[PDB]
Amino acid sequence: DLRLHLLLNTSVTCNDGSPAGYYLKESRGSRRWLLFLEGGWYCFNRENCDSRYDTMRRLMSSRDWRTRTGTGILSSQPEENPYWWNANMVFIPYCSSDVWSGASSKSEKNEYAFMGALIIQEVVRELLGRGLSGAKVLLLAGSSAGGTGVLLNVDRVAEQLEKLGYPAIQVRGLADSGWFLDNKQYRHTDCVDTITCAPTEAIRRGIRYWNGVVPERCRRQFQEGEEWNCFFGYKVYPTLRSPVFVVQWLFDEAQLTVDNVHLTVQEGLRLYIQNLGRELRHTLKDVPASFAPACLSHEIIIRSHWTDVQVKGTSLPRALHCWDRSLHPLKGCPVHLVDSCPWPHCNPSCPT
Numbered sequence: 001d002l003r004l005h006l007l008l009n010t011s012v013t014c015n016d017g018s019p020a021g022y023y024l025k026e027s028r029g030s031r032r033w034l035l036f037l038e039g040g041w042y043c044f045n046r047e048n049c050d051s052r053y054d055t056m057r058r059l060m061s062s063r064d065w066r067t068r069t070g071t072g073i074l075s076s077q078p079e080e081n082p083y084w085w086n087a088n089m090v091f092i093p094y095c096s097s098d099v100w101s102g103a104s105s106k107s108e109k110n111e112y113a114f115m116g117a118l119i120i121q122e123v124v125r126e127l128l129g130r131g132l133s134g135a136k137v138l139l140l141a142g143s144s145a146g147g148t149g150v151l152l153n154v155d156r157v158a159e160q161l162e163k164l165g166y167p168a169i170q171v172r173g174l175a176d177s178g179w180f181l182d183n184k185q186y187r188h189t190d191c192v193d194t195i196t197c198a199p200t201e202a203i204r205r206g207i208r209y210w211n212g213v214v215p216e217r218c219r220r221q222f223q224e225g226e227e228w229n230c231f232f233g234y235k236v237y238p239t240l241r242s243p244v245f246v247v248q249w250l251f252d253e254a255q256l257t258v259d260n261v262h263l264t265v266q267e268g269l270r271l272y273i274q275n276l277g278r279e280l281r282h283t284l285k286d287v288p289a290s291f292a293p294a295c296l297s298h299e300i301i302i303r304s305h306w307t308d309v310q311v312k313g314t315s316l317p318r319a320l321h322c323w324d325r326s327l328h329p330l331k332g333c334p335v336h337l338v339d340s341c342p343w344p345h346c347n348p349s350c351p352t
Ligand SMILES: c1ccc(CNCc2ccc3c(c2)OCO3)nc1
Pocket: 015, 016, 017, 018, 019, 063, 111, 112
């Protein structure tokens, strides 16, 4: 079990003004620290944030959060977690609805606070008095909206630790299921409410509503008004300096949802699905640390059975171990693992 701590700086809040926080299980014999960012979509105007508050309130508030069990990469049992079972474990709940990008407080002009980027900074700060000052590696991990949050925030955590006087701690990222394409959709709707708004248009509006922040080098490339581009992995990744390992299902269910596809198959859709896998594979060609199986799924790293899937005979925990060794090719220890077969479940190890 990981134990809840609410932030001592109570100006750093969830959407409704309640304090943000983190869950922690220390391993005092270890100098490795895993900070995991939870996912769960986003909201981008008053009307859709109000709805989310009624039926997804744990993603907007800490009022109803004392312990949580660590699973997958957050498990302390080597049977479930062959990679980092002895590490210090931190789960950061997603209560800002902003893809971890926001820097805006609730105020006379703002019904909600969007503080995701500041929540990450404050967690790192408070952890530095609880053992993180002695770390050798800080791995910032996350799933779905939390995976995109890794891409947006990993270089900011690295800069923070350097400016606080800890330049020797190695900061790295692990982004799971947060590598999306701004691709052509299977069917199209003009952006008129929540359901009809494609991600490019919803994120453009969100950035303005949240006062969202993107990494500096990416921001300098795309410039004012085009920051939405930095929420797309293939565009932001080449601007990052920290090492980042990318986990992405080739036929991700959230990607298919935003593409207006429902699987529940004739030539047009067959060609669309095969083209999506081909395009995703293409964007990972020059990503040296990656794991991308040919499956229809969403998320993996905190699932208890995350050990089961394999690409070219190598599991995800093994690939992450090989990544560690590479940061000290390697015979029998690969780090770039992308499937090449063209249809969901052409890999027999895909989840059922
Ligand atoms: C501690 C602190 C705050 C709360 C929430 N209380 C209801 C509420 C008030 C104002 C709001 C809001 C919700 O959403 C945006 O503005 N609970 C426990």
